[PDB]
């Protein structure tokens, strides 16, 4: 092991996971992995995740999302440097109350455009629009609001993101 | 040891294991040897398998699934991601009453084109192991064989009601 | 150590062997060195080894079949997905009556093409060659003919199949607790 | 492990940390990850982060700066050779009163030019924009100087040696002894 | 890890560092570590530090002269094979007293060659004239002897060094 | 230059041009370069295509199709060895009378499966389509033939393609 | 030399240029290049060229524009396979009159998203460049401005024929 | 240009083209071009194929040999230093009476079993099962043996010397001197 | 030889040169060369060079400016992409009058940082910073400090803007056969 | 091209070849298809081979050999550093009475070591054979003899192999 | 052949030569090479040696040097952007009045530290003897004292333009268009 894998394997022992780099299949898998072994060494304890990722893949991350529901205790989620595309939904995807966000933290809103190449495009089309909508209501907002800014690549800063509704705290002083 | 090693090893030894990858000998190995590692630590307790996988080989897939029912202990399966071609086999080989699908997982269905022998022979064992592979499938979701490989030629997709409505599943798990 | 490793060391601690590979000198070294560690290890308790390889050269099989005899445990086995050409000979020369087969399972008779001066190695390929056809009718209780028929045009078996021929002893469906 | 992490997570057990490269997202999570660790293991103990350091991104320093306002306990700055760009950032926004500065460091101040992601190069302009803005005001906290005087000094790329640093307001103290 | 990594370890439980390589920015953020640590671990007890090093860049020999001179335990120093440039300049940095060279050991001076080029021009200039003094500080030697013999690479066999002022012994046996 | 590409360089001098790897957009500019450089040489002279590809994009496929309209020459086609996806279909778009088969060539039918995802998804639908319809014009087969026939990877011998309508010839003695 | 540097040269021969990937830098320098030289050979005769490009750079793509405007020749444009983005506009910039579709060329339209310096600089050329662009663009189409960047916006694409009405092109030869 | 490569072309302008590797659809289409360039050029000079090929593919081979017969022109094939599998069967299907082989020329048979391109296994297995069958066929209408003991001996991985090869009907002549 | 090197040897038949890339030693020493040798075929004749250049080292672009100078016949300048730090010193280098411009070309001010002994190499670098503001502004027409200045700020221009500026004499659109 | 293939090709015209590597498939292919195409272009003038080669594959050799004797012209051998296993093969083969030999060059004799492996066995025997007799041939010498040396790797001076019969001259000038 | 390599031939029949990189054995060869064929064409014509060389080993630089002694033509030097060490060496060894410096042109001045690559004593030995043949050689070229030029040597003396045609190293500087 690394030093890099040891503190997070350090940080996993104090039930808290990053989400530093691209949404795929792979980091997905792995993050997946933690939330279940979390969430099988005890239920009751809060799980923090911390997220600087450009985003990635809507699969990829609806499957973390997934996972992250399916996990009983609270997910509490923290935008630390970046928060795009799917980075941005697992942080709405927090537990209600324990969504933060740190002061100079950065979420944008994006549409990704993402076998047979219809059968693709018709998955993608399901899932995407299941995006909208969980992202609509995570953020109390209307889905034609969450189309509309996602389409122009509308960004948030800290402050922005809490009016819009994508975290509940800005870590200011002292968490 | 990695990271990623390290919690699936921490996860082996709460007896979860995960199919996250294409399906072919060498996952297929790995997967075998989990399955008969954890039946030997323990013939009473479940095991857990998560499977996000785009499928792969038919051969690969039937000795994970022969491995699956060596084992006496109950196999409970998770559509947590996707589940394709034999993603989608394993998944409906799970104990009955033990498959699972996340709320957002995707079942594909799909015939595999199989592909240091004589060719003649291998069209003959992959004749033989899919023709068994559809039998299973059918058993499986409860359908008949007819609309199995019907649905199989066209590449038929289900999100995870429409799964469990085939028979590929028996509960969808929104919160554990 | 990798996850792999980690699973096959543990395995190891269960007297369990995997042959997932094919059949050459480096595998062979291996699979000598794991029989001999268990036997060393423990002379009494059984070991299962599954098999699900390719094959390949008759030499190494043959070195890890002199192994297995040279074990005094019971060797176990197991024709976990495909044995083919050494697969299927270490599956044969498995312990009469811990010969398992599972349901579909594969066992592929094939005749290897071998391959220091070549008449020399010509003449230990003849050998050892004619040697494995003797103890594989030995093991599957087949007329040496009847092999070498069947080598030549690469005959295959179903698990039921294997279990009438003589290659195995067990299909098992299911182990019990 | 390597001898190198080794030594470095030994140190992690005495609430050590190190920025000893060029700051970037990777670093930048690394980093953030120990503070996060070591906040979490003890949230009522100090922390030193030693600095030699020749700065980088805007973004990743922030992201460092964030994490270390939202630890609790108190973090030590060490200027240990050079505190550069950001590396001077993150020095003088240690706790007040534990930021040192060593006898022959050195203290850069330098305004990035940020610039590749897969992003509008107009929204790219309007966050470091705001970002850049938010440095030279967090800089001017840190020193006590005013922000034309951060952002003038920041053009010409002025430097400082441990007792000018001292002076400026970059760090507290110059420790020759301990 | 692996064997050397190993044994720098063992040793390292020992209180015992080695510079063995160039120094640059990455073996010197490793020694000023390991010092942290050590000093961490017990400022009571004494550092020991072998020397065999080609020498290397100045601003990085700083660093760890610095850390060295926070540590607040005595450091030894030891001349085992070559000390160079910065190698000649942490040896003499030594605790004064526990500064030793083995018999066969060289001790070799050098000026080293060492943003904006005219800023970096600026920092090299202050800190080398820094280095010169500390050189002639360690030693004892006048600074124009230090530049004079700096600049005509002089070099010394463990006696030569020993008078010179680079160390205080000559151990033979411990 | 090396043997090979003066082999090629040579028959091009005498109008003979190969398509003897995948269908691609580089192999399809190659190749729509060389038809042009031929046409714009000699208008009058007929150029050779002999075919001996596993296939590949239909885009590139239309494109080469499309310079081979484009050039008043005629074009005869030559399955050479394999003639799949479109190299059956460039095979089938040779001059009516100059399509010539090989002995033991075969000739696959094979229905391929191909920024926004939906937008590739449209456009693949619309060319696709339009596939289907020139190959049953070539052909003079029904288009319901065509879909079927390529839906179930339909192979056939020289002879049966010959009668299937993919080529007019079969070069059993001394072109 | 190679057999595609050969045909292309032989090509350059008959005042024939290729456009056949992204735009960037380099593939501008190169058809910047060719350009001048066909003009500087002889400046009465025409210039072809054949497009199937998946677009790129605007820079790069103004920068090809300008030497296309500066040879005296006229310049015909082939949309071949494929014309985005610049692609696009480079077809459209052809010599009016002479910018030919194929049947079954597609014509994307896209506003880039671009990305030594410092960014704040980059960001106003950026700005600049491609309000000329939807300019120009709006010019070659007579199209209005409005249009062309709503239709930009969307990724609209095109057919031949929807093309030619669009105002991309002037024909659409299915012979010569 | 490499001095191979242009030996080989000065040769090719002699009308003389080799096969020397193993059979393969590059080579194949490498071969297939030089004939249909030298039946192009003059289709009523002779063309001269050396061979010296451990053998391949038949699907390739096939090709070759579709190609030969679409040449007008007579191809001499010459057995130089080993002609195995469809390096044999291309040898034998040269023009009848311009078959030679060298002195000490080895041929070789052997039933190659195929197996991986995008194609489903079932597909593979019968085009391979036809050019198979096609390929007995043409070998024993070549040899003029019946297509048993084609078949037979192709098992059996038979090879003979020049004289051997020369009995069983391969090459119509040895040339020991010119 | 390549299709790329082919066009630009025809063209360096035609007596025109290309700077599509960063100013450095290597390609200092490329340009230099091809100036030294249209000059020696003939000193008649003028020379084009093509610019579209991010720019690069003092010292190189210095190099091919002395190169520049010391070509008898006329140097025309045209800003064809992009001409940048170097780019923008070697465009207005150019023979007074024909300095070119296209219409979309932009042309960047900037001050470069350089990067032996350092204090050497420190000097060196500010004499020939200093003396490449004193040719800029020669170039021009402006002050020197004004150089300065807008270097400082990574000024840039439009076709329209460096026409007024100094940089170059025309903007031209089309070329007359 | 290549200075060295250009050197080659010049020399081609001037027929002249080369065998200056190891004795392989490539190798032989290459050189019989340049005796070809010496043998086309004139099938009246010598063709020179200049041998400094380690020697390689019987069947490679024998390859050449079958090409060599093929073709019509007298084909003259220049042992010219090193003839070792085919390349000693080779140069006796050469024309008789055009064999030649530089006055520094050595000739070594070996047997080289050398599908079903059964198969391969019983054609390198054959071959093996062959090669004994043709060398016998050559040389003048018993088969008996050639087997005995060639089992010892005897090796010859030029002198000595002029004695035993693998060349006809020792050429210290042209 | 290459863009870079056919302007190089083509400047090499005008019978220009550069010298554009560090020197080593390689680029002596290469450059003594250009000079004997020069010197072979047309022993009556001048040669012009463009110099922009950042200097290297002394062998070689001599190497180049004695070649240049051994053409019985002329041989012009231009220091065009970059003559240090053996740059300077070599650009100060051309014909006394044609030894040419561009207007921006910078000759540095640098003792070379040989260094090892057979035993050490005598490859050190060579190198004093060789050393010391530079300095005498270069103190005859500028016609200054060798204390000097060894003085000069040992702080890496730099020179412009002016400078150097002071010092002695070129005769002219050529502003205008010769």
Redesign the interface.
């Known amino acids: 092991?690394?030093?890099?894998?040891?503190?997070?394997?350090?940080?996993?022992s104090?039930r808290?996971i990053?989400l530093?780099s691209e949404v795929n299949?792979?980091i997905?898998?792995?993050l997946?992995?933690?939330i279940?072994?979390l969430?099988?060494?005890d239920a009751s304890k809060d799980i923090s995740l911390?997220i600087?990722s450009?985003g990635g893949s809507i699969?990829?991350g609806?499957?973390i999302?997934?996972?992250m529901?399916?996990?009983?205790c609270d997910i509490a989620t923290y935008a630390?440097?970046?928060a795009?595309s799917m980075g941005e939904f697992l942080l709405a995807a927090g537990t209600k109350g324990k969504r933060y966000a740190?002061?100079?933290?950065?979420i944008?809103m994006h549409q990704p455009?993402?076998?047979?190449?219809?059968?693709?495009?018709?998955?993608?089309?399901?899932?995407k629009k299941?995006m909208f909508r969980l992202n609509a209501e995570f953020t109390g907002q209307p889905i034609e609001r969450i189309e509309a800014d996602s389409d122009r690549?509308r960004?948030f800063?800290a402050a922005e993101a809490l009016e819009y509704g994508f975290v509940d705290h800005i870590?200011?002083?002292?968490?």
């Open positions: 092991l690394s030093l890099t894998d040891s503190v997070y394997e350090r940080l996993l104090e808290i990053f530093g299949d792979e997905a898998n792995r997946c992995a933690q279940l072994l969430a099988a060494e911390y600087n450009p699969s990829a609806m499957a999302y997934d996972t529901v399916l996990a009983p630390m440097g970046m795009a740190l002061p100079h933290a950065r944008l455009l993402g076998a047979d190449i219809a059968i693709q495009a018709e998955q993608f089309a399901v899932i299941e690549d960004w800063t870590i200011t002083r002292a968490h």
